[PDB]
Design an enzyme around this catalytic site. Structure first.
Site, mmCIF file in Angstrom:
data_model
loop_
_atom_site.group_PDB
_atom_site.id
_atom_site.type_symbol
_atom_site.label_atom_id
_atom_site.label_comp_id
_atom_site.label_asym_id
_atom_site.label_seq_id
_atom_site.Cartn_x
_atom_site.Cartn_y
_atom_site.Cartn_z
ATOM 1 N N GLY A 105 -7.205 44.163 -45.025
ATOM 2 C CA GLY A 105 -8.288 44.285 -44.062
ATOM 3 C C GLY A 105 -9.350 45.277 -44.450
ATOM 4 O O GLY A 105 -9.414 45.713 -45.600
ATOM 5 N N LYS A 106 -10.213 45.613 -43.495
ATOM 6 C CA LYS A 106 -11.321 46.527 -43.751
ATOM 7 C C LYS A 106 -11.679 47.305 -42.520
ATOM 8 O O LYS A 106 -11.450 46.825 -41.407
ATOM 9 C CB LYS A 106 -12.554 45.726 -44.213
ATOM 10 N N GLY A 107 -12.217 48.507 -42.738
ATOM 11 C CA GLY A 107 -12.747 49.392 -41.702
ATOM 12 C C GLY A 107 -14.251 49.155 -41.653
ATOM 13 O O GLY A 107 -14.710 48.125 -42.162
ATOM 14 N N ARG A 108 -15.046 50.108 -41.108
ATOM 15 C CA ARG A 108 -16.525 49.959 -41.091
ATOM 16 C C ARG A 108 -17.031 49.979 -42.524
ATOM 17 O O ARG A 108 -17.920 49.210 -42.884
ATOM 18 C CB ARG A 108 -17.228 51.077 -40.294
ATOM 19 C CG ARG A 108 -16.768 51.244 -38.853
ATOM 20 C CD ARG A 108 -17.274 52.548 -38.244
ATOM 21 N NE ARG A 108 -17.128 53.672 -39.175
ATOM 22 C CZ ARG A 108 -16.045 54.436 -39.279
ATOM 23 N NH1 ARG A 108 -15.010 54.250 -38.465
ATOM 24 N NH2 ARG A 108 -15.998 55.409 -40.177
ATOM 25 N N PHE A 109 -16.429 50.866 -43.334
ATOM 26 C CA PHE A 109 -16.643 51.051 -44.762
ATOM 27 C C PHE A 109 -15.226 51.122 -45.357
ATOM 28 O O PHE A 109 -14.277 51.516 -44.671
ATOM 29 C CB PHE A 109 -17.413 52.363 -45.033
ATOM 30 C CG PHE A 109 -18.768 52.456 -44.361
ATOM 31 C CD1 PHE A 109 -19.850 51.712 -44.829
ATOM 32 C CD2 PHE A 109 -18.961 53.290 -43.261
ATOM 33 C CE1 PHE A 109 -21.096 51.784 -44.195
ATOM 34 C CE2 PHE A 109 -20.207 53.370 -42.634
ATOM 35 C CZ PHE A 109 -21.265 52.615 -43.103
ATOM 36 N N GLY A 110 -15.062 50.690 -46.586
ATOM 37 C CA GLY A 110 -13.733 50.766 -47.174
ATOM 38 C C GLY A 110 -12.774 49.653 -46.796
ATOM 39 O O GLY A 110 -12.579 49.320 -45.617
ATOM 40 N N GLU A 111 -12.122 49.130 -47.826
ATOM 41 C CA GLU A 111 -11.175 48.035 -47.746
ATOM 42 C C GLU A 111 -9.763 48.612 -47.782
ATOM 43 O O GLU A 111 -9.482 49.501 -48.594
ATOM 44 C CB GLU A 111 -11.407 47.090 -48.939
ATOM 45 C CG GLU A 111 -12.880 46.747 -49.148
ATOM 46 C CD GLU A 111 -13.354 45.334 -48.856
ATOM 47 O OE1 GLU A 111 -12.662 44.588 -48.122
ATOM 48 O OE2 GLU A 111 -14.452 44.986 -49.346
ATOM 49 N N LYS B 143 -7.056 53.017 -48.493
ATOM 50 C CA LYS B 143 -8.382 52.655 -48.019
ATOM 51 C C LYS B 143 -9.343 53.005 -49.143
ATOM 52 O O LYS B 143 -9.402 54.155 -49.589
ATOM 53 C CB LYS B 143 -8.723 53.306 -46.665
ATOM 54 C CG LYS B 143 -10.096 52.875 -46.118
ATOM 55 C CD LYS B 143 -10.160 52.722 -44.613
ATOM 56 C CE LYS B 143 -10.135 54.024 -43.895
ATOM 57 N NZ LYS B 143 -10.746 53.908 -42.546
ATOM 58 N N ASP C 213 -14.233 56.323 -31.664
ATOM 59 C CA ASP C 213 -14.210 54.883 -31.915
ATOM 60 C C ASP C 213 -12.849 54.304 -31.581
ATOM 61 O O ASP C 213 -12.351 53.435 -32.297
ATOM 62 C CB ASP C 213 -14.627 54.544 -33.362
ATOM 63 C CG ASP C 213 -14.939 53.066 -33.604
ATOM 64 O OD1 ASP C 213 -15.140 52.318 -32.606
ATOM 65 O OD2 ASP C 213 -14.902 52.641 -34.777
HETATM 66 N N1 LIG Z 1 -2.013 52.521 -42.504
HETATM 67 C C1 LIG Z 1 -2.112 51.200 -42.365
HETATM 68 N N2 LIG Z 1 -0.988 50.469 -42.556
HETATM 69 C C2 LIG Z 1 -1.068 49.138 -42.481
HETATM 70 C C3 LIG Z 1 -2.278 48.476 -42.195
HETATM 71 C C4 LIG Z 1 -2.403 46.997 -42.079
HETATM 72 C C5 LIG Z 1 -1.282 46.165 -41.966
HETATM 73 C C6 LIG Z 1 -1.418 44.804 -41.698
HETATM 74 C C7 LIG Z 1 -2.663 44.238 -41.497
HETATM 75 C C8 LIG Z 1 -2.802 42.824 -40.986
HETATM 76 C C9 LIG Z 1 -2.940 41.792 -42.085
HETATM 77 O O1 LIG Z 1 -3.109 40.500 -41.532
HETATM 78 C C10 LIG Z 1 -3.783 45.047 -41.662
HETATM 79 C C11 LIG Z 1 -3.657 46.393 -41.972
HETATM 80 N N3 LIG Z 1 -3.405 49.191 -41.992
HETATM 81 C C12 LIG Z 1 -3.355 50.539 -42.068
HETATM 82 C C13 LIG Z 1 -4.658 51.244 -41.794
HETATM 83 O O2 LIG Z 1 -4.723 52.464 -41.809
HETATM 84 N N4 LIG Z 1 -5.704 50.438 -41.487
HETATM 85 C C14 LIG Z 1 -7.065 50.744 -41.184
HETATM 86 C C15 LIG Z 1 -7.617 52.023 -41.375
HETATM 87 N N5 LIG Z 1 -8.888 52.325 -41.087
HETATM 88 C C16 LIG Z 1 -9.666 51.355 -40.581
HETATM 89 C C17 LIG Z 1 -9.225 50.069 -40.316
HETATM 90 C C18 LIG Z 1 -7.892 49.756 -40.613
HETATM 91 N N6 LIG Z 1 -7.334 48.498 -40.258
HETATM 92 C C19 LIG Z 1 -6.426 48.475 -39.105
HETATM 93 C C20 LIG Z 1 -5.607 47.206 -39.129
HETATM 94 O O3 LIG Z 1 -6.445 46.018 -39.223
HETATM 95 C C21 LIG Z 1 -7.352 46.079 -40.336
HETATM 96 C C22 LIG Z 1 -8.204 47.320 -40.275
#
Ligand SMILES: Nc1ncc(-c2ccc(CCO)cc2)nc1C(=O)Nc1cnccc1N1CCOCC1
Length: 303
Positions: A16-22, A36, A137
């Site tokens: 996934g992605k945040g506002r910036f950074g994948e 990230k 946010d």
């Molecule tokens: N520590 C983590 N562990 C696991 C996952 C994760 C696990 C599974 C999936 C679903 C796939 O189908 C996505 C992401 N994300 C993070 C994380 O910090 N994400 C994160 C940080 N900053 C901004 C946006 C973020 N995301 C929040 C989750 O959704 C995407 C954006």
């Protein structure tokens, strides 16, 4: 070589992605980590989030566990990394869309979110203490669900920290930085006093009450629950503008509907009362995150 560093991490899957950074799932010394990744032109966003994550006394079970901030040069370009714990379930948005919860499941999700926010907002006075932090946010897309069915808050790039000694905010904050849907009334109409740090804590509370509404809809009792919806799904388009939100929340004074069936169950009644007390147009009248944690702890003890 003990501490976690970028050159020893292998990216396995884009998640996934945040506002910036994948965000990627990576493997570090046999363990799963979230990475990230930011580009060189996104250094300010990367630095700011590393700066928040490194705040003294921040670590808490309901706050995403920070590991390291690092750089990785592939030989052509440099990537800026934020390495953290990996939570397989993803965010609360994904979890609630996929599942319904029990009364116990709901309280665990709500209580852990309130406990993380209470810890974030908490100031421990002194040089060896902790500054109060406001998220700015908070939403279901920024709250992660751990294996044990509890939450942890992530995505701290928009956060602000308070210094008790100087009575100041660590940055000069821009107006209306967050997700429009979750913006507090005072943020939507720009009446927010950016000079008082308590204003930021109060706007986070408003957004948390919206997140609790999203959780409560998915609480299944006798197989009866509502379908998944974002707050204001019934009033605004997808990707609402500030003016679309402001007309609804500020001018018309509407909040998400509290269904009749939430009065039939004690857990749902306590949740519905917290919601109305997070949703006051007057920020000063809203509950504190600490008071919500106390109310939900009492409810978890009783259940
Ligand atoms: N520590 C983590 N562990 C696991 C996952 C994760 C696990 C599974 C999936 C679903 C796939 O189908 C996505 C992401 N994300 C993070 C994380 O910090 N994400 C994160 C940080 N900053 C901004 C946006 C973020 N995301 C929040 C989750 O959704 C995407 C954006």
């Amino acid at each position: 070589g003990h501490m976690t560093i970028a050159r020893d991490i292998v990216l396995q899957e884009s998640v996934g992605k945040g506002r910036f950074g994948e965000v990627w799932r990576g493997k570090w010394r046999g363990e799963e980590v979230a990475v990230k990744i930011f580009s060189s032109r996104e250094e300010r966003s990367w630095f700011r989030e590393a700066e928040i994550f490194q705040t003294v006394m921040l670590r808490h079970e309901n706050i995403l566990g920070f590991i390291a901030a690092d750089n990785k040069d592939n030989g052509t370009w440099t990537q800026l990394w934020l390495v953290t714990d990996f939570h397989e379930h993803g965010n609360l948005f994904d979890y609630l869309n996929r599942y319904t919860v029990t009364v116990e499941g709901m309280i665990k999700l709500a209580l852990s979110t309130a406990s993380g926010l209470a810890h974030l907002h908490m100031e421990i006075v002194g040089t060896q203490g902790k500054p109060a932090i406001a998220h700015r946010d908070l939403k279901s897309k920024n709250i992660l669900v751990k294996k044990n069915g509890t939450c942890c808050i992530c995505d701290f790039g928009l956060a602000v920290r308070h210094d008790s000694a100087t009575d100041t905010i660590d940055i000069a904050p821009n107006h209306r930085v967050g997700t429009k849907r979750y913006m507090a009334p005072e943020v939507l109409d720009d009446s927010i006093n950016m000079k008082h740090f308590e204003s930021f804590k109060r706007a986070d509370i408003y957004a948390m009450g919206l997140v609790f509404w999203e959780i409560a809809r998915r609480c299944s009792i006798g197989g009866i629950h509502e379908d998944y919806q974002l707050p204001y799904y019934d009033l605004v388009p997808s990707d609402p503008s500030v003016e679309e939100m402001r007309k609804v929340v500020c001018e018309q004074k509407l909040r998400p509907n509290i269904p009749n069936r939430w009065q039939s169950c004690e857990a749902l009644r306590v949740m519905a009362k917290i919601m109305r007390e997070c949703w006051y147009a007057n920020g000063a009248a809203r509950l504190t995150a600490l008071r919500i944690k106390k109310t939900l702890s009492q409810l978890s003890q009783q259940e």
